[PDB]
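Hello again,

I reread your note about wanting to compare the complex against the isolated chains. To keep things tidy I'm splitting this into two emails, and this first one only covers the full assembly. Below are the input lines as submitted, including protein chains and any nucleic acid or small-molecule components. They are followed by the predicted structure of everything together. The single-chain runs will come separately.
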Amino acid sequence: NTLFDDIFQVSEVDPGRYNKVCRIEAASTTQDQCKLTLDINVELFPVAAQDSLTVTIASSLNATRSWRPPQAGDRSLADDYDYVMYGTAYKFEEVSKDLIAVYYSFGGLLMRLEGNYRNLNNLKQENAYLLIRR
Amino acid sequence: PQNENARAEALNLANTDSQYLTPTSGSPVRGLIQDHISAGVWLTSKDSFFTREQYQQYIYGCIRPEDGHTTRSKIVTLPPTIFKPYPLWTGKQIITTVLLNVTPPDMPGINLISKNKIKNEYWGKGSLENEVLFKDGALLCGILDKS
Amino acid sequence: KAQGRTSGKVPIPGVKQALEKKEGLFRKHMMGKRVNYAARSVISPDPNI
Amino acid sequence: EEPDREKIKLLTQATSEDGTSASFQIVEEDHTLGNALRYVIMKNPDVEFCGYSIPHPSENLLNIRIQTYGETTAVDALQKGLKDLMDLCDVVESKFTEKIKSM
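Full-complex prediction:
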């Protein structure tokens, strides 16, 4: 089930001493209080400045138990996207009033969401799939 | 030593496991040295990605259930941190797996908030790789050093 | 104690000098000894043990 | 006759009760067989875990470990990867025989 979905306009793609990992900074196009900061594997999914990405955070993908490599005859929520990661939320913060930030870590690849309407259904769960279309 | 009394004391009292901290001021004296210090900065780096065939070779190459390194009589793995285009594990996620197999299953994970020796400007702009974070036995942030 | 010949290098150290030195009897054969069932060798590194 | 009974050796202290998670010990081997056999076992769609290990370099012992998802043992997965390692060396031998004829 989708816990967050928006569309983010990329402002800066910073390689920064890495050959496969870039830092993305993207404010959204629908709400004005919310920003993104993401570490993507730029070899698999190359992101430039002034892109129009589509970030979605789900809690699962649709009766699974543990990971198993994909086979034929499956269908996932990841089929609709281009770059799916997986990681844990570890820190909640309110930056000021009317803003609450969450921090994700996709095995060391970090993400920071700031905003106001994500305090509804971003729990502190040890599993939140992150999906990017286009 | 040549009897069972003196064997039970080199196993329990004078053994190397109980001499981890020194009696002078409590500092630890035992740890890895040079090529192990300078590989943790490469393995637990953020550039380090591993395919599935590479990931299980590094787990079994260090942890063998035959010699008695596991605790669950079966090697357990993690889901990858990249699913769709090409499924990949991260180098910090191998450290989570080697602590998931050598620490006992009844206790919860280790929770540590520490630092490194390598400053946050060496890695780039707005990185946080000086802060070592272990949450539920999972390295989520920061490389590993001599520290 | 004894002067005797007084030419130097006095022989037969006697039963006190068999006890008093760094070696003597009481630090080379009581407080430190030589042992059976021991070995020594040059050491070499290994990361697989 | 006499089949050789010290080459392959299943270590029962690491072996599952179903049979699906076992660890073998091959004598007088190294990375040559072990890295080539691990590539071929890992292409089985039923293999969950596969990796080899040389315990110490001074003796010539090779531990390999196979774990399957069920519905195939680690001995049935070892012998498919021993079959396809033979049938892969018969494609390299045939393509290289033809090109010597094709010179």
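For quick reference: Residues 45 and 120 of chain A are 29 Å apart (CA to CA).

B.
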